[PDB]
Amino acid sequence: GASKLRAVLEKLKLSRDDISTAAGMVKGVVDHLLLRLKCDSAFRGVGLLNTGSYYEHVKISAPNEFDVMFKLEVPRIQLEEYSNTRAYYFVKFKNPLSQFLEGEILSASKMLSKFRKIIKEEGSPAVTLISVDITLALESKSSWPASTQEGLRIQNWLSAKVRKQLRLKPFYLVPKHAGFQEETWRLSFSHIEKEILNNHGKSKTCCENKEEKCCRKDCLKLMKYLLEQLKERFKDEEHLDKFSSYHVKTAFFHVCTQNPQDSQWDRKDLGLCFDNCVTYFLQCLRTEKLENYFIPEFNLFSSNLIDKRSKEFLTKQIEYERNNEFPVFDE
Ligand SMILES: O=C(CO)N1CCc2[nH]c3c(Cl)c(Cl)cc(-c4cn[nH]c4)c3c2C1
Ligand SMILES: [Zn+2]
C-alpha cells in the first residue's frame, strides 16, 4: 500500500531533526541583519516576513540551505503594469526611500545595491551568505492588483469566505527583472501560500486529529522530492535548471482546487493522490501552460520563461519515472 512513498517521506523526515538547533543558527544571524538594517535611514521598517517566521527551504532535500524574506512597510504605493506582463510592475508613491528614486519610478537596482552594501558591511531576487537566501519585499496594504481578480480560486475548496479574508491581507513586491528590463518589481504572495498550506482542508479540523489526517502535504513533499532528484541527476543537461519547487507548488494548488473535498486526499490513498499530482504536472508540461495560482494570465510554463525542449525533457523523465515505479525514490 504505497510503501515506497512512505519510506521516502520517512527518510526525508529523519533529515529534519538536526535543524531544531540549525534553525537557531539562522534565526540569530537574521535578527542581527534585521536589527542593523534598522540603523540605516532607508530600511527603518524592515522585518521578518512570515508570521510564524519559519524559514522554508525551496529544496525539500537540502536541509542545509534556507530562504527568508525581509518585509519593510512603505507609504501608499501606486503601481504601473509593465508591457502587459501581469506580474511585473513599476512602483510610484501617492519619505526616507526618496534616495532611491529615478524620476518617478522607484529604482529596484538602486535599492539592491544599498541592500547588498549594508549586509556586505556586516537570479535577481535574493542575495546569499548552511546557506541562506534573503529576498527584499515591499509591503503594500492596498487592494490586490487587477490581474489577481480571477486568481486564488479556492471558493469550492477553502470557501469564498476565506478567499475574501485573504484578499484583505497585504501583498508584496520583490525586485525582479524580466530584454531584461532592469527596473521592474514582481508580485509575491508567499504569505498566502504558507497560510493555505498549513490550513489546507475543507474541514477546519483537517490534520488536527487522527480521524482527519490527509495526505495533501505529503503529496507536495513527494512532488518536490521528485523534481529535486531529477534536477540533480540531470544537472549536466541544462533543460532542468529552469524548473523549481514553485512550479510544483503552483501545480499542487491547482490539484487542490480540482480536488476540493478532503475525502479525495485520504491518507490511505497516498499512492493514488500522489499519482494525481504527477498526472496534472505532466499535463502542464505537455500543454506548456502552468498559470500562476494568484495571477492566471502569468503562464509560468510560457516559452519566454522555459524552452519547449526542456518541458518535453522533464516530461520524458517524469513519465519514465512513473512507468518504472519511481527508481529515483529507492535506496
Ligand atoms: O527560484 C525561482 C526562480 O528564480 N523561483 C522559486 C521562488 C519563486 N517565487 C515566485 C513567485 Cl512569488 C512568483 Cl509570483 C513567480 C515565480 C516564478 C517562477 N518562475 N517564474 C516566475 C516565483 C519563484 C520561482
Ligand atoms: Zn489535512
Numbering used by the authors: 161 to 254, 260 to 287, 304 to 310, 316 to 364, 369 to 521
From the paper:
The placement of a methoxy group (G098) resulted in a 2-fold improvement for inhibition of h-cGAS but not m-cGAS, while the placement of a pyrazole group (G108) yielded a 4-fold improved IC50 value for h-cGAS to 27.5 nM but a 300-fold reduction to 5.15 µM for m-cGAS. To explore the structural basis for h-cGAS inhibition, we obtained crystals of G108 bound to h-cGASCD. During optimization of crystallization conditions, we realized that double substitution of amino acids K427E/K428E facilitated crystal packing and improved crystal quality and inhibitor occupancy substantially compared to wild-type apo h-cGASCD. The electron density in the 2Fo–Fc map (contoured at 1.2 σ) for bound G108 can be traced for the chlorine-substituted pyridoindole core and the pyrazole ring of the bound G108, but not for the hydroxyl-ethanone side chain attached to the non-planar six-membered ring, due to its apparent flexibility. The tricyclic pyridoindole core of bound G108 was sandwiched between the guanidinium group of Arg376 and the aromatic ring of Tyr436, while the pyrazole ring of bound G108 was anchored in a hydrophobic pocket lined by the side chains of His437, Phe488, and Leu490 of h-cGAS. The pyrazole ring of bound G108 formed a hydrogen bond with one water molecule in the binding pocket. However, we also observed a similar reduction for G108, which although it has the ability of hydrogen-bond by its pyrazole substituent was not as deeply inserted into the binding pockets of h-cGASCD to reach the Tyr248. At inhibitor concentrations of 10 µM, representing cellular IC90 or more for the inhibitors against cGAS pathway, only G108 showed weak off-target inhibition of the directly cGAMP-stimulated STING pathway and the hairpin-RNA (hpRNA) stimulated RIG-I pathway.
Binding of dsDNA to cGAS activates the synthesis of c[G(2′,5′)pA(3′,5′)p], a diffusible cyclic dinucleotide referred to as cGAMP, which travels to and activates the endoplasmic reticulum membrane-anchored adaptor protein, stimulator of interferon genes (gene symbol STING/TMEM173). Activated STING recruits and activates TANK-binding kinase 1 (gene symbol TBK1), which in turn phosphorylates the transcription factor family of interferon regulatory factors (IRFs)10 inducing cytokine and type I interferon mRNA expression. Likewise, embryonic lethality caused by deficiency of Dnase2, an endonuclease responsible for degradation of excessive DNA in lysosomes during endocytosis, was completely rescued by additional knockout of Cgas24 or Sting25. These observations support cGAS as a drug target and inhibition of cGAS may provide a therapeutic strategy for preventing autoinflammation and treating diseases such as systemic lupus erythematosus (SLE) with involvement of anti-dsDNA antibodies. In summary, we developed a class of h-cGAS specific and potent small-molecule inhibitors active in primary human macrophages.
